[PDB]
Amino acid sequence: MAERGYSFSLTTFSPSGKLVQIEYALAAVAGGAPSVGIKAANGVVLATEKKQKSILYDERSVHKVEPITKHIGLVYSGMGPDYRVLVHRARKLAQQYYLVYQEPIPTAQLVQRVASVMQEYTQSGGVRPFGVSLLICGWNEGRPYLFQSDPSGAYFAWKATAMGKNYVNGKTFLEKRYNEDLELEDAIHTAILTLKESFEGQMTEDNIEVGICNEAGFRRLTPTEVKDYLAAIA
Amino acid sequence: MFLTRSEYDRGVNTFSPEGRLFQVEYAIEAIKLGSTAIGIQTSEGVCLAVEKRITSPLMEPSSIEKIVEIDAHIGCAMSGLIADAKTLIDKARVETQNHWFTYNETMTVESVTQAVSNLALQFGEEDADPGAMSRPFGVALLFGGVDEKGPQLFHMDPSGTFVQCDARAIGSASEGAQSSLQEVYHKSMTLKE
Amino acid sequence: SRRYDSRTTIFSPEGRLYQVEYAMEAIGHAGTCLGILANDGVLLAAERRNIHKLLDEVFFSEKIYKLNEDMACSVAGITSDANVLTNELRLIAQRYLLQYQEPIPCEQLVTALCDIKQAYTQFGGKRPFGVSLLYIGWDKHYGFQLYQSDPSGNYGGWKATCIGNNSAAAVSMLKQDYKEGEMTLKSALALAIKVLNKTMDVSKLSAEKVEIATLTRENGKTVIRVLKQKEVEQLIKKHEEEEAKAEREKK
Amino acid sequence: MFVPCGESAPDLAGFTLLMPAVSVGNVGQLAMDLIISTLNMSKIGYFYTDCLVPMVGNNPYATTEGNSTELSINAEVYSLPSRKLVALQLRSIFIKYKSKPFCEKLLSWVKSSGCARVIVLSSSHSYQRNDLQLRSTPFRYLLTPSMQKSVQNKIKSLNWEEMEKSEFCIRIPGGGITKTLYDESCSKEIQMAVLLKFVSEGDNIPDALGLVEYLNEWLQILKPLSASRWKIPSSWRLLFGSGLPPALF
Amino acid sequence: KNELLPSHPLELSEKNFQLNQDKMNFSTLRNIQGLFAPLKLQMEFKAVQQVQRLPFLSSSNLSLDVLRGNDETIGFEDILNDPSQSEVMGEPHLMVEYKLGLL
Amino acid sequence: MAATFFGEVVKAPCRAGTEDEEEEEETPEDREVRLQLARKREVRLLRRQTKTSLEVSLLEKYPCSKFIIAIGNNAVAFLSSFVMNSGVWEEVGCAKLWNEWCEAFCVFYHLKSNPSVFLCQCSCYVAEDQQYQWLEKVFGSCPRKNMQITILTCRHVTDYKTSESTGSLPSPFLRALKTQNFKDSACCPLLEQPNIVHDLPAAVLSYCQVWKIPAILYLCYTDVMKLDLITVEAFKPILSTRSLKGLVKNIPQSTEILKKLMTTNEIQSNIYT
Amino acid sequence: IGTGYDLSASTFSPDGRVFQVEYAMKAVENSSTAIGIRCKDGVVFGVEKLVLSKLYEEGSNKRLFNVDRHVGMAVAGLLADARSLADIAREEASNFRSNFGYNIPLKHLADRVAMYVHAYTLYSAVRPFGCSFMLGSYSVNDGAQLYMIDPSGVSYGYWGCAIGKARQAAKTEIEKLQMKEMTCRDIVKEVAKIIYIVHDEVKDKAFELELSWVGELTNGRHEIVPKDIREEAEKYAKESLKE
Amino acid sequence: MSRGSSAGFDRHITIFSPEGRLYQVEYAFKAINQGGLTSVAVRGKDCAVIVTQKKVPDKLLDSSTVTHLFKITENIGCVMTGMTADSRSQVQRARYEAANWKYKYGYEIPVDMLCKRIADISQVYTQNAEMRPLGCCMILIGIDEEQGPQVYKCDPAGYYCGFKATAAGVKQTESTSFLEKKVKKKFDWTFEQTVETAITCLSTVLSIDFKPSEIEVGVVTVENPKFRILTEAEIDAHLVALAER
Amino acid sequence: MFRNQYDNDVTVWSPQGRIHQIEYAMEAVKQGSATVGLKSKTHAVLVALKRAQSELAAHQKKILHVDNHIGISIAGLTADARLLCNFMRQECLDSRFVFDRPLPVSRLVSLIGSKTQIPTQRYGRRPYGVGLLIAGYDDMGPHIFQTCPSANYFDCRAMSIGARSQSARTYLERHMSEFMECNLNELVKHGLRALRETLPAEQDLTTKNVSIGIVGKDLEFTIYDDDDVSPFLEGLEER
């Protein structure tokens, strides 16, 4: 069952009923840099690894973990430019919601809108699905939130998950480690350990990027704080 | 030394190595699939005769209309795809009525045929946003009418060319009917003959 | 065939749209979704499918979707296409309410969504919606109804039907164990539990693998509520007790 | 199935059969034309059959004037006893539901003649290509189980890439008749080797040159590795035909 | 019809605000850059708009927004009335045929 | 190669025709309709005179010494103008076939004075899968190897391949292609090496070459093909040589007038005036 | 070789070459040679315009276009594309005069037309232009400026260049010519000599030499070389070819 | 695409590979390499320098017109590697975007934002089927008000990262290794020091000693934020200083 | 052999650098009937060889009016020919409405060239497979312009296009000097002789198959058919 013609096209359904191009986009996601998100009782942490090819990389130029609004942040695994475009769209949608309702956009609604955009891009024939999955974090109604938007547009609410390379092993590690009443400043350590499992070499302050969200709001940890956490956990 | 499967028959806007547009010729073949229609131009009037292909006796013979009235002085006999014929007939009637409205006179048979032909050449060349004739029309028309010049008989082809004919036959048996016509037709024949 | 199945608009020599059939196969790949109609009310019992321990359920309906006050629906197919279709369903229902100031009849909404899906299947360049929806609702014309939609764009009113995995076996079981006219809400729940227990061969239902929503009419108001995990556990326990009693009697 | 040129009816016991399996862009036919022209192989007979569409014309390898005026057909077979090579040359396309009869006829002919190690010079589609194949060499080889072990060890030493068959169905996206040829040859239990290359449609002379070099790596009928390596047929003039009209430029 | 006459002097201007902005950008490029920039942007816009949802479904037009520079700009147009919440939707086939130019 | 919509995936057509086989490679209904098409397309050789189906091949039934075959409207027009009026030619047999692409007939004639001399005016097209069946029906399986076959056909200047452009080429020019056994003078330049013939003349010539039958193929390349007098004028050199020297009597006058009759009764191209 | 990558202008070859642009360049190469030499006083053009038939009136299919009062245009490759690009350049220069009130600089016009060509090569709906042209102008401030545009969309200034069949021979002749120190008259004479030298009378039966120049002697206004001076240049070329 | 989507995975920009890679973007990178030149940009604490090899092929060619150093605005300059026409188009687009930013926001566009816009346009190119990625690379330099010198390279895929020492072209890997070695040894990184580092890096990777006419150098310093193109005499002076020490 | 991929479309460049669709349009115009167009110092004459589909069918017209001073000779596709004639008529009407003067022939030919160039560059469109011989009178005098399916146009003193037009072109090139300085009747007879040279030796010119269009200094474009061309045929020498 070569099904080459079915795999070439996006709108064409496979005889078994599988959208092959969506699976290829998911494979692209799986080939991206590992990223770990853990939803603790006190908050939610988004930790990822930014593999810098050479030391001549300005850490402040780009950020894998970006804020969407004052209380929502997200991380990605896969293609960078697609992530940047989706970040811009998410920020615009959040600001539109704030203007219309004069209320910070709930994390779930933003995830639904982003997933709708992904579905719109994966439906029409002529473009390719976004080869990136977003781990979106937030804090609404005094409750942490963690979501994962797939390229197809299916979003799932997780308590702890990992994407990118070695994501199955990361999920198994989180299952072994994650605890129901786990608090922040410890889920950070768990995410750092998961990255260690998924990291090849030594993890420094500049080799990884950690962003947390709590009652105060979303905040990307500074390199100094990442270094202190790394020292504490090892 | 090796043969090639060079194809030029699919695209309407594709020229063959000899310059032939094969889609138009396949429209002509579609005409050849239709029933035989005979039109004779005489000095006492025009004679349009076509055969009704009644598949079953239950179907109403009057329902199979192949000779229609464009205007009081113009008639048309179709051969080929029926719905394409209907569209062309509607265009011809609208054009004749527009001409009457604008100029308060009957439209010449040649003018009506020219207008219908102008409609029947917009395949990949209309350059209009509205859905145009993507494929060439699959019907050939025989616009037989009498105007101030006298009886007239024009034959419209899928390509879009209209040529005045003294006696024309189009359909499945077009060649044999044409041979018989040219064997029997003479200029000074009467309408009854 | 490897042909007539590319543009979603090529008729096969026998007159078949293979892309629609492939969409139906995709539906078959989805989880089991079951709906049973009873005189007291109509219910939807759907398999939650995703059971990952780390997965969180922040919404009250994992796959059930309330369209309006008097209507609800369930999904078996592509999740994102299902989300957009549910949004369109809600939009159409609210448009009808705005225009006529009365709840939309179930058949009208089902017809509108099926028209949307058929339009998507008719014009080339658009992937057909690979979602099959089961609708439960109450209106002032036909009372309780159960409807089933397909990717092709064809709907139908059923008294008990199933879509998704092991649909044929569930339909056969319903035909065997459905009493047209004498079916009540409690017996309907028992039948749904039996059908789910037999169809899902992984293990006995634990009330987390399934999700049951019942639609009823109380004090002239349509009540759509999702059965709590404890109630589903009690129903599963009752079904297990019945099966054990039958086995003991068989001897 | 096989008609000799005259009445000689040459025997081909212990020979090696070469054919141009109809590829995506006649790469096999180009490679066989190159081999025939380079080795100065003379036509010993005609593989007249219903399957190949008919054609006629002057011999591709005109060389001299007398040899230039010789009429060739769609399927002419050339042979030279020095290297014990018999080279079939298909010069046309196939008819629908006619590949299997041709394969059966050819297998029967080779079995009766006595030749072994049927070399199937073919090509496959370069766009129906996997990522691993995309990053690897376009050349692939396929060996029948009955093929003698010595040549299998020779090719293993050459370190060639076997065609990736996927359960284990051996499907060649662009082979044409190559797949069913392999199946029927395995059924008949006769030594045969398939040499293919991932190519596209267009100027395929470089593809033919690569294919003949790949075949040389095993057969070693010419030197290992140049100027005038393989002599091109004189009929390879006007790969496009006609000329440039003066009005355009 | 009297509908052709604008009810408000500002209505005609803001109804075609996006079209007028694109026309002004093309005019500026063409004044300064040349014929290549407007033609390039026109083809780019046509390509992005050619791929989207069907008319009866609200499209995101993300690529169009990125090309037009509105991906990070919000105006009254985006917030005041939502194309998603149309409140008026015609027959799907009718809308598709209307867009195709058939009607 | 559809490109119906924006994202349609198009595939480059293969000049070798592989994709057709790949799609091809059952259901009883499909097999039944395929066999119906096969028996609809097969050539049926019979004679309208007495309506006696010719199961036996023409060659087996009558022994032929000179078979002149004309394919194409111009070739059959030339033969009708020059050889019929020279003597007497009665119809014996007529192949009937149906093709997707198409006075389309394949009628055979034989001289009353010398029955050994036969004729064939194939004004119809024969598909690539039916030339071999036609050869089986006419020549049978056992040939004679004693037949002078002169194949006549008309082609287009665009088909001819040469360095000079098609327009620069003298349009009314003709080439020849003869088998090994045919040692008679071709009277025409031999076809260029890259040029190829892939129609019924090619099938007949290949059949003659394989079975050692002396035959010659004439190809009259012309810019126009619809009953053109220049094509038959350029064919005249063929009868100027042997073989057709005795069949046509020394009466060019009637043939010249007869040739005009065929050209006058012609159908012009409506699309191109 | 881009066997499966040479069908669309929006497709990259594995090595990173867009073969449609290269085929357009080859189409340009199919055309007769057109040369243009820039000197201190101005720019002089010259084209080996082959006459296909004696029936054609003198001046038919002119390869020299006046896109502006001060800008010339010597074209090669497909003639239709040359006319289209000449019209585009005319619109650009007209627009610059209308907007900024002064004649468009040669460099700016060359950039505009080159970017137009590149935009056409960008997409798959359209095909790259099959023509290459030379834009030349002279001004008192700007001075003598000569530019050449390739179907790819490049725009490079030259002291002398050629486009067409015998591009390299004409380029070598211009290289061994010291244009920077000669006047317009000597330059046109040498242009005629080079055109006659590079013309192949065997393959090409006959040709008509079209000469135009823009410079101080023309008051910064592109015009065809006067018939007397053109005849003198042709005579000098004949004498040079004879020896 | 109007013509039609290609069949093979690597024959079209939109459709994915089984791994999920987009081969057309990689082929655009191969085109950037096909450009034939190498560009080196070095960031110091006082100025940013871009150096690229200038190769005038023919004597008739006017060397003044042959240049890969373009200024986007008065304070931002760029060096382009890859196809010449594509690089020119990207330069024009960047100029227009910078002018629009100045008009709309009241202050000059930062370099990072310029590359962000360019990379967004590039992503749009890589997502749709009608268009193709530009076969060129953009390296932007400029002095930020607060962050000081800034160097950003800006690629077809849509990656807009910033670097302390950027390299692009045929010898990108070797230049990157050399610049990493130099950066690991943190010098003062003065203006002339940065110019020397760039020139010597290019010479080392190209294995040739440049004369004044074989390279073009553009600089922008904190003291003089205007983008400045080094005159051939100044480049010759820098080369002489390199030769002496 | 290797040009199959590049033969189908007009936006695809062949490796040799030649679009084959344009050449196929040229073949299409060649396949049409033959027309001859020549001009003297004061008149421009278009003589065409009309073809009839059948004996009963009337001969299809090949000389079409454009303006009071411009006419064309049809050759090739009829639908594209009618489209081009309508476009040229509209252009002439616009010129006479705006500037209140006849449109110069050269400007009209340039407009036609641009119009026919537009399709050859875009996708989904085919070149106009029609060739036109345009005869007109301007302040510069008589004009004969040849329009090819390729957008490029030619200015000619005498030209023939269509099937078997090589003999007519040879005859025209034989007597160009005679054409330039001759009477109107002599010019018409020369055109008729060229058209006859196109015809086979057996065939001869008749009033039914000859259409003549003449435009001169004081003479507007008038099309002569049948009895109107009989005077010109009378006095013609035997071939």
From Swiss-Prot, chain A:
The keyword Acetylation is assigned to this record: yes
Residues with Phosphoserine modification: 7, 14, 16
Broad class of the protein's primary localization: cytoplasm
N-acetylalanine: residues bearing it: 2
Record's note on what induces expression: Down-regulated by antioxidants BO-653 and probucol. Down-regulated in response to enterovirus 71 (EV71) infection (at protein level).
SUPFAM superfamilies the record matches: N-terminal nucleophile aminohydrolases (Ntn hydrolases)
Effect of residue 110 to V: In a colorectal cancer sample; somatic mutation
CDD domains: proteasome_alpha_type_2
GO biological process, one term: response to virus
Residues bearing the modification N6-acetyllysine: 70, 171
InterPro entries, per the entry: Ntn_hydrolases_N, Proteasome_alpha, Proteasome_alpha-type, Proteasome_asu_N, Proteasome_sua/b
Entry annotated with the keyword Nucleus: yes
Localization per Swiss-Prot or TrEMBL: Cytoplasm; Nucleus
Phosphotyrosine found at: 6, 24, 76, 121
Cellular component GO terms, alphabetical: cytoplasm; cytosol; extracellular exosome; extracellular region; ficolin-1-rich granule lumen; nucleoplasm; nucleus; P-body
PTM characteristics: Phosphorylated on tyrosine residues; which may be important for nuclear import.
Pfam families xrefs: Proteasome, Proteasome_A_N
Biological function: Component of the 20S core proteasome complex involved in the proteolytic degradation of most intracellular proteins. This complex plays numerous essential roles within the cell by associating with different regulatory particles. Associated with two 19S regulatory particles, forms the 26S proteasome and thus participates in the ATP-dependent degradation of ubiquitinated proteins.
Name of the protein in question: Proteasome subunit alpha type-2
Species of the source: Homo sapiens (Human)
Phylogenetic lineage: Eukaryota, Metazoa, Chordata, Craniata, Vertebrata
Gene from which this protein is expressed: PSMA2
From Swiss-Prot, chain B:
Transmembrane segments: none
Modification N-acetylmethionine, positions: 1
Top-level taxon of the source organism: Eukaryota
GO biological process, one term: proteasome-mediated ubiquitin-dependent protein catabolic process
Expressed in which tissues: Expressed in fetal brain (at protein level).
Presence of keyword Acyltransferase: no
UniProt induction comment: Up-regulated in colon cancer cell lines. Up-regulated in fetal Down syndrome (DS) brain (at protein level). May be the target of the transcriptional activator NFE2L2.
Subcellular localization(s) per the UniProt record: Cytoplasm; Nucleus
Residue positions where Phosphoserine is found in the record: 16, 56, 63
Chief place of localization: cytoplasm
One GO term describing the cellular component: proteasome core complex, alpha-subunit complex
Positions of post-translational Phosphothreonine modification: 55
Keywords for this protein: Acetylation, Cytoplasm, Glycoprotein, Nucleus, Phosphoprotein, Proteasome
Protein family (similarity comment): Belongs to the peptidase T1A family.
Reported function: Component of the 20S core proteasome complex involved in the proteolytic degradation of most intracellular proteins. This complex plays numerous essential roles within the cell by associating with different regulatory particles. Associated with two 19S regulatory particles, forms the 26S proteasome and thus participates in the ATP-dependent degradation of ubiquitinated proteins.
Protein name per its UniProtKB record: Proteasome subunit alpha type-5
Parent-record interval covered: 1 to 193 of 241
UniProtKB/Swiss-Prot annotation, chain C:
Annotated positions of the N6-acetyllysine modification: 126, 175
Signal peptide: none
UniProt induction comment: Down-regulated by antioxidants BO-653 and probucol.
GO CC terms in record: cytoplasm; cytosol; extracellular exosome; intracellular membrane-bounded organelle; nucleoplasm; nucleus; P-body; proteasome complex
Pfam families, A to Z: Proteasome, Proteasome_A_N
SUPFAM superfamilies noted in UniProt: N-terminal nucleophile aminohydrolases (Ntn hydrolases)
Presence of keyword DNA repair: no
Keywords: Acetylation, Cytoplasm, Host-virus interaction, Nucleus, Phosphoprotein, Proteasome
This protein's record includes keyword Acetylation: yes
Phosphoserine: residues carrying this PTM: 12, 74, 172
GO biological process: proteasome-mediated ubiquitin-dependent protein catabolic process
InterPro entries reported for this sequence: Ntn_hydrolases_N, Proteasome_alpha, Proteasome_alpha-type, Proteasome_asu_N, Proteasome_bsu_CS, Proteasome_sua/b
UniProt main location, coarse: cytoplasm
UniProt subcellular location: Cytoplasm; Nucleus
Family: Belongs to the peptidase T1A family.
Quaternary organization: The 26S proteasome consists of a 20S proteasome core and two 19S regulatory subunits. The 20S proteasome core is a barrel-shaped complex made of 28 subunits that are arranged in four stacked rings. The two outer rings are each formed by seven alpha subunits, and the two inner rings are formed by seven beta subunits. The proteolytic activity is exerted by three beta-subunits PSMB5, PSMB6 and PSMB7. (Microbial infection) Interaction with HTLV-1 TAX protein favors NFKB1 activation.
Protein name: Proteasome subunit alpha type-4
Organism: Homo sapiens
Gene name of the encoded protein: PSMA4
Curated annotation (Swiss-Prot), chain I:
Positions where N-acetylmethionine occurs in the chain: 1
Modified residues (Phosphoserine): 110, 177
Short name of any one Pfam family annotated for the protein: Proteasome_A_N
Cross-link Glycyl lysine isopeptide (Lys-Gly) (interchain with G-Cter in ubiquitin) mapped to chain: 115, 208
Classification via CDD domains: proteasome_alpha_type_1 (cd03749)
Compartments in which it is found: Cytoplasm; Nucleus
Cleavable signal peptide: none
Gene Ontology BP annotations: immune system process; negative regulation of inflammatory response to antigenic stimulus; proteasome-mediated ubiquitin-dependent protein catabolic process
Protein family (similarity comment): Belongs to the peptidase T1A family.
Function recorded in the entry: Component of the 20S core proteasome complex involved in the proteolytic degradation of most intracellular proteins. This complex plays numerous essential roles within the cell by associating with different regulatory particles. Associated with two 19S regulatory particles, forms the 26S proteasome and thus participates in the ATP-dependent degradation of ubiquitinated proteins.
Subunit structure and binding partners: The 26S proteasome consists of a 20S proteasome core and two 19S regulatory subunits. The 20S proteasome core is a barrel-shaped complex made of 28 subunits that are arranged in four stacked rings. The two outer rings are each formed by seven alpha subunits, and the two inner rings are formed by seven beta subunits. The proteolytic activity is exerted by three beta-subunits PSMB5, PSMB6 and PSMB7. Interacts with NOTCH3. Interacts with ZFAND1.
Name of the molecule in the record: Proteasome subunit alpha type-1
Source species: Homo sapiens
